Design a protein around this ligand. Structure first.
Ligand code: CLA
Ligand code: CLA
Ligand code: CLA
Ligand code: CLA
Ligand code: CLA
Ligand SMILES: CC(C)=CCC/C(C)=C/CC/C(C)=C/CC/C(C)=C/CC/C(C)=C/CC/C(C)=C/CC/C(C)=C/CC/C(C)=C/CC/C(C)=C/CC1=CC(=O)C(C)=C(C)C1=O
Ligand SMILES: CCCCCCCCCCCCCCCCCC(=O)OC[C@H](CO[C@@H]1O[C@H](CO)[C@H](O)[C@H](O)[C@H]1O)OC(=O)CCCCCCCCCCCCCCCCC
Ligand SMILES: CCCCCCCCCCCCCCCCCC(=O)OC[C@H](CO[C@@H]1O[C@H](CO)[C@H](O)[C@H](O)[C@H]1O)OC(=O)CCCCCCCCCCCCCCCCC
Ligand SMILES: CCCCCCCCCCCCCCCC(=O)OC[C@H](CO[C@@H]1O[C@H](CS(=O)(=O)O)[C@@H](O)[C@H](O)[C@H]1O)OC(=O)CCCCCCCCCCCCCCC
Ligand SMILES: CCCCCCCCCCCCCCCC(=O)OC[C@H](COP(=O)(O)OC[C@@H](O)CO)OC(=O)CCCCCCCCCCCCCCC
Ligand code: OEX
Ligand SMILES: [Fe+2]
Lengths: 38, 52, 50, 334, 35, 42, 245, 30, 42
């Protein structure tokens, strides 16, 4: 190895942006399912 | 020809030059350190710690 | 404190890990093209090329 | 200073991630070739004439199998015991038909496992350890060489060798039962006692240590965090677990010595698998197990059945059905 | 098929010779006791 | 007759990205409970 | 030859020599006697070809692609006996005994394995003239038996003269008035006999040694596994050798 | 189509064997 | 002929429990980076 990277950061996702990203996936799953099942 | 009774499976003459140049190419590496040493230096141990 | 859309900007001031990342995209592109072409040979049928 | 001394210093260095050693010079090229051919022959390999009757048995995943049924098929009955490498096969298609990769995998396996065993010796020498972990590993090496090497020798063909698979294992065990009666043989009896006893004393020793652990944690965190690595204090009250087992059976049946205790855990399985692997070996040369068929008779002389006669009728069912086309003559001499 | 065969005897007696001349390389003296 | 690879498209198109976004939230709350130093940091 | 007969058994074995027919030396004529009986006719093919649908530039006419044999050295026929009867117009041959079948398997492009029984059973040869000459050329029909004798058991355990006759691990197929008649073809095992046409051609004779030998060409039909598939036409070529006595 | 799942389970199992050997949590004294 | 509900059994039997065990590791390392107070806690 070498030394520890000084470019370590942390990732954040608040409770607000969770519900956006969940609803984004389910609505795209509702929309595109009917075409994939054909 | 599988069940021929030939030495080390050497079917053709070309495979010998493979064997001789394999043992000797590492033998010559080995003689670069452990060769050309004194063949007349003993010990009363069970194990020798002479040199490199 | 990075958002999820800035997580890969830790490699801006790090050339040594800029390569290791660019090698990992390469190992996924090359692994795709190998495993796609293995998938296509199980599906291809050379019975009638006409 | 020399190039060889700077290479011997690296190849015997314990400062490597994995110790290579001088046995790794022929462990690693052997086992990586047994591996890289096994993954290809298990996934993509055409069917193989095993019975020598030109009825090819599928064994790979691309030819409609799964994890259970798929298997690297042993070589042909037509080859038998002959050495069949790639260069003595005139094409790879002729090699893969006649059971090619079974000999390439097995022979590079038994060299690599007998070199993995000597590698366990070598690092014990360079670390200051007493040497004999590799003697305990002799017991599965004895058993691997019994079903892949010794049993094809005494039966005269690699086709009787063990198929590299899961359903092929149970084709091997049942046909070995009908032709050799392994369950009545006292060396399979001495290794069933080796692994039933081995799994007993494993879970019996592992419970008495875990029973007598010393308080070093709280009830919120894990039990395992009361052991700091490399500590010099003993992590369990061994007097406590001795007084428990000294009352659970009686007093004199308990090892107070932890060294003699941890030796008996290494004795019992390993001796049980040395003896078992020399059961397959002595039954490779058709010295079968016991045969008590028609042993109990009345005074009239009529045969009174026993449990061995019921066991015989199970052996007669597998004997008349194994290799149902390969036989032409009334006695399975092979 | 006689071109592959040449390649194997190279690779075998390469590593076999590393094995043979490995233990001839004063191998008992390579212990943590002394030297 | 429907395509039987569409069940794998939808139910992994739901679950795999949605379980991803849950993970970025759980480690967000763990870092906030990590710094806070009381009863949950450990 | 007599050169092969010089060797002992330990010098021939493992060398692939016993597979190969002899090489006759020189050319002359030999006359078949009234009681003339053919002694050591061996046939060995040197090339194989299976009729397929070939991928030309724009067309798909049927052509022969060749193939690689995969059973190793087991293809040669040997020791084929038979009397040589003299019809007035044309000399004839009818084989009687000897090893007159050699099962083998060739592989096509694509990975398809085509087994076929290579045989000369019940051969009626007819050739121009009376005496064997370097221009002599005889041939005729032979009967191919099936590749499997009827007591062969398939993976389910079904044969023509033994075994079951239904899908033995599918016990709900024989329910109803129809039964299992949807898979009827894979239950009925039919022994099949087809025809084959070989064409031999003598070109080198010894009369001082009474042994002939030349080039043949044989066509026949591959196997079907008792009606499991459509058999395919197999052409082969090679060299033979015979002792005319 | 069926054997594609079996292959993915096998090489996926060999991935986590690779990461367990080389990226192991190295134990340390003190 | 295979059962088409087995793809959903296996590929969710892999992914759903295996993505679960990843989450317990990521929040474990986030709590350790949370308490540590340097460059990653936030
Ligand atoms: C050559 C290609 C390339 C490269 C190397 C980058 C590199 C970068 N971009 Mg950029 N970008 C690109 C193309 C590229 N971009 C394109 C084409 C667009 C238009 C869509 C954008 C739009 C864009 C925006 C709007 C932003 C960036 C940002 C960034 C930075 C961080 C990326 C990050 O955090 O994402 C992390 C991403 C994730 C954690 C998940 C993303 C999930 C995606 C949406 C779906 C999954 C991807 C899918 C599997 C890919 C299939 C392959 C397909 C590309 C063929 C980084 C410097 C950020 C920036 O400016 O840095 C401060 C930022 O805010 N990019
Ligand atoms: C280095 C480790 C190693 C070892 C031990 C083997 C061993 C073997 N391989 Mg393998 N192989 C290896 C690496 C290795 N392989 C690698 C790295 C590859 C990838 C290229 C292959 C690829 C490969 C293929 C593709 C095939 C083999 C095959 C074989 C077998 C026969 C090969 C042969 O003729 O050996 C040559 C051996 C010798 C000439 C003998 C050397 C022994 C020396 C001389 C020591 C003896 C000392 C002597 C007795 C002292 C006498 C003193 C005097 C005074 C009397 C054999 C089991 C074949 C096989 O298994 O087919 C079934 C086969 O087809 N191998
Ligand atoms: C089954 C494998 C095996 C293993 C793991 C060991 C292990 C050991 N042997 Mg040993 N040995 C063996 C078989 C084995 N032996 C056999 C079969 C012989 C008789 C030929 C010997 C003769 C022998 C002597 C004379 C010496 C050792 C020594 C040693 C120790 C150090 C390693 C060394 O330098 O030996 C080198 C390794 C060997 C000699 C055997 C190599 C075995 C290979 C890896 C696998 C088996 C292949 C087969 C036997 C070779 C056939 C070749 C042919 C096909 C061409 C170690 C405990 C040394 C020691 O410490 O003694 C105190 C020592 O001086 N051994
Ligand atoms: C209650 C039932 C019972 C029990 C407990 C046993 C117990 C046993 N039977 Mg037995 N048997 C039974 C019923 C039973 N039998 C019945 C009913 C039959 C008749 C069908 C048989 C027929 C039978 C046969 C025919 C055989 C046994 C054998 C054995 C032994 C197996 C141990 C073994 O092979 O490990 C030893 C370990 C190995 C063989 C593995 C070696 C692996 C090497 C060292 C390394 C491999 C590494 C691997 C490739 C990769 C590692 C992981 C990687 C990711 C790194 C054991 C004593 C075998 C035997 O006698 O011993 C040979 C045997 O051949 N039995
Ligand atoms: C009902 C419970 C039971 C019991 C008591 C046994 C007992 C036995 N089985 Mg068995 N077995 C069982 C269930 C049982 N089995 C089941 C459910 C199966 C699977 C279907 C098998 C399958 C099986 C196979 C396949 C084989 C056995 C064998 C054996 C024998 C040795 C096993 C051994 O040493 O294990 C290891 C355990 C120990 C060493 C602990 C000690 C066990 C002994 C018997 C107790 C000692 C107490 C002593 C007699 C009392 C005096 C002491 C006193 C002074 C305090 C032994 C007679 C083997 C055999 O045939 O041997 C002849 C054998 O081949 N068994
Ligand atoms: C008066 C009237 C009415 C008349 C009728 C007469 C009458 C009263 C009759 C009744 C009498 C009657 C039958 C009573 C007898 C009672 C009796 C014994 C009945 C039970 C019957 C029976 C079959 C018993 C025999 C079975 C038995 C218990 C066998 C014991 C087996 C045995 C000796 C095992 C030892 C194995 C062993 C060596 C284990 C140690 C190895 C091991 C790894 C242990 C782990 C371990 C051990 C340690 O040591 C310590 C330290 C630690 C750390 C540790 O890990
Ligand atoms: C993390 C998420 C992981 C899931 C990814 C989700 C993606 C879902 C969408 C792709 C799946 C939908 C395919 C239909 C399913 C189906 O059964 O198909 C099944 C078909 C395969 O089709 C099958 O094939 C078999 C033999 O091949 C047999 O013939 C079957 O009969 C036939 O159905 O699969 C696909 O078509 C997969 C295609 C995926 C690649 C997409 C190519 C187009 C991409 C263009 C990119 C443009 C993007 C621009 C940006 C916008
Ligand atoms: C998180 C993981 C989420 C995935 C769960 C993974 C579980 C996988 C195992 C269950 C799925 C396997 C079913 C086969 C798939 C298939 O296609 O089936 C498909 C069948 C349905 O069958 C379909 O039915 C249709 C009409 O109903 C049509 O008839 C179809 O032809 C027919 O195939 O589904 C099941 O059988 C699901 C059963 C699940 C319930 C299990 C009951 C048994 C439980 C006993 C519990 C004992 C446990 C004791 C502890 C051990
Ligand atoms: C009708 C015929 C009658 C029988 C005839 C005899 C035939 C041959 C018998 C062979 C006897 C061999 C004696 C070996 C002694 C020895 O091992 O000591 C090793 C140590 C020494 O004891 C330890 O010894 C130490 C004292 S000292 O070393 O002995 O001085 C002491 O510190 C320590 O506490 C103590 O545990 O003992 C132990 O650690 C316990 C293991 C005992 C193993 C013996 C049992 C036999 C093997 C099990 C059966 C096979 C297993 C597989 C079965 C499938
Ligand atoms: C092969 C591997 C497959 C990889 C797939 C994995 C990645 C998949 C998921 C990533 C995308 C996640 C999007 C997160 C979403 C997210 O977290 O939002 C938050 C994000 C930015 O938020 P901030 O900058 O406030 O973030 C602060 C940080 O603390 C957290 O991000 O917003 C966006 O990036 C743009 C807004 C998109 C928000 C969606 C808007 C559309 C609303 C939904 C519309 C549907 C309803 C329609 C009704 C008609
Ligand atoms: O190869 Mn496999 O199994 Ca031994 O027995 Mn004889 O050979 Mn065959 O029969 Mn039975
Ligand atoms: Fe212990």
């Amino acid at each position: 190895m070498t030394g520890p990277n000084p470019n370590k950061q942390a990732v954040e996702l608040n409770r607000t942006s969770l519900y956006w990203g969940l609803l984004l996936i389910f609505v795209l799953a509702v929309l595109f399912s009917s075409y994939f099942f054909n | 020809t599988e069940g021929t009774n030939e030495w080390f499976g050497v079917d053709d003459l070309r495979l010998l030059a493979v064997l001789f140049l394999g043992h000797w190419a590492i033998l010559s590496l080995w003689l670069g350190s452990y060769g050309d040493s004194n063949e007349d230096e003993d010990f009363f141990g069970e194990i020798d710690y002479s040199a490199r | 404190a990075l958002p999820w859309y800035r997580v890969h900007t830790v490699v801006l001031n790090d050339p040594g890990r800029l390569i290791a990342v660019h090698l990992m995209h390469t190992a996924l592109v090359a692994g795709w093209a190998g495993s796609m072409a293995l998938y296509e040979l199980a599906v291809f049928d050379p019975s009638d090329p006409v | 200073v020399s190039l060889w001394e700077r290479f011997c210093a690296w190849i015997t260095s314990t400062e490597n991630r994995l110790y290579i050693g001088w046995f790794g010079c022929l462990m690693f090229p052997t086992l990586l070739t047994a591996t890289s051919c096994f993954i290809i022959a298990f996934i993509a390999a055409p069917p193989v004439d095993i019975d020598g009757i030109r009825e090819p048995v599928a064994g790979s995943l691309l030819y409609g199998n799964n994890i259970i049924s798929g298997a690297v098929v042993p070589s042909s009955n037509a080859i038998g015991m002959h050495f069949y490498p790639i260069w003595e096969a005139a094409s790879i298609d002729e090699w893969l038909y006649n059971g090619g990769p079974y000999q390439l995998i097995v022979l590079h396996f038994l060299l690599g496992v007998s070199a993995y065993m000597g590698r366990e010796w070598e690092l014990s020498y360079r670390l200051g350890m007493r040497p004999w972990i590799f003697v305990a590993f002799s017991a599965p090496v004895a058993a691997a060489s019994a079903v892949f090497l010794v049993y094809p020798i005494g039966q005269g063909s690699f086709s009787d060798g063990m198929p590299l698979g899961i359903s092929g294992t149970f084709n091997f065990m049942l046909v070995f039962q009908a032709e050799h009666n392994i369950l009545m043989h006292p060396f399979h009896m001495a290794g069933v006692a080796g692994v039933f006893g081995g799994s007993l004393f494993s879970a019996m020793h592992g419970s008495l240590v875990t029973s007598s652990l010393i308080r070093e944690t709280t009830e919120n965190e894990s039990t395992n965090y009361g052991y700091k690595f490399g500590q010099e204090e003993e992590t369990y009250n061994i007097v406590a677990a001795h007084g428990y087992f000294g009352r659970l059976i009686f007093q004199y049946a308990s090892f107070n010595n932890s060294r003699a205790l941890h030796f008996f855990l290494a004795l019992w399985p390993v001796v049980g698998i040395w003896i078992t692997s020399m059961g397959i070996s002595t039954m490779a040369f058709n010295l079968n197990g016991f045969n008590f068929n028609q042993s109990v008779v009345d005074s009239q002389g009529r045969v009174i059945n026993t449990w061995a006669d019921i066991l015989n009728r199970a052996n007669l069912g597998i004997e008349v059905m194994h290799e149902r086309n390969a036989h032409n003559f009334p006695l399975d001499l092979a | 098929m006689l071109t592959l065969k040449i390649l194997v005897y190279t690779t075998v007696i390469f590593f076999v010779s590393l094995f043979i001349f490995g233990f001839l390389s004063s191998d008992p003296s390579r212990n943590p006791n002394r030297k | 007759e429907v395509q039987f690879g569409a069940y794998l498209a939808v139910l992994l198109g739901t679950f795999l990205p949605a379980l991803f976004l849950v993970n970025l939230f759980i480690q967000t709350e763990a870092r906030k409970a990590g710094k806070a130093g009381g009863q949950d940091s450990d | 030859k007599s050169q092969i007969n010089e060797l002992s058994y330990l010098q021939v074995k493992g060398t692939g020599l016993a597979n190969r027919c002899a090489e006759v030396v020189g050319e002359d004529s030999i006359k078949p006697k009234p009681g003339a009986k053919l002694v050591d006719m061996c046939i060995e093919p040197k090339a194989w070809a299976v009729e397929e649908e070939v991928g030309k530039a724009g067309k798909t006419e049927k052509k022969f692609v060749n193939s690689k044999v995969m059973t190793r050295q087991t293809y040669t026929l040997d020791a084929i006996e038979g009397p040589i009867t003299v019809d007035g117009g044309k000399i004839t041959f009818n084989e009687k005994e000897g090893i007159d079948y050699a099962a083998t398997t060739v592989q096509l492009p694509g990975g398809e394995r085509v087994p076929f029984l290579f045989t000369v059973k019940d051969l009626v040869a007819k050739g121009n003239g009376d005496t064997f000459k370097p221009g002599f050329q005889m041939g005729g029909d032979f009967n191919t038996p099936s590749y499997r004798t009827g007591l062969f058991l398939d993976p389910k355990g079904r044969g023509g003269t033994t075994g079951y006759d239904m899908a033995v691990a599918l016990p709900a197929l024989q329910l109803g008035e129809e039964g299992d008649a949807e898979l009827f073809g894979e239950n009925n095992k039919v022994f099949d006999i087809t025809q084959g046409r070989i064409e031999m051609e003598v070109n080198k004779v010894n009369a001082e040694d009474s042994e002939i030998g030349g080039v043949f060409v044989a066509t026949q039909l591959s196997d079907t596994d008792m009606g499991s598939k459509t058999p395919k036409k197999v052409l082969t070529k090679g060299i033979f050798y015979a002792k005319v006595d | 189509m069926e054997a594609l799942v079996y292959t993915f389970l096998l090489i996926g199992t060999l991935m986590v064997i690779f990461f367990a050997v080389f990226f192991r949590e190295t134990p340390r004294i003190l």
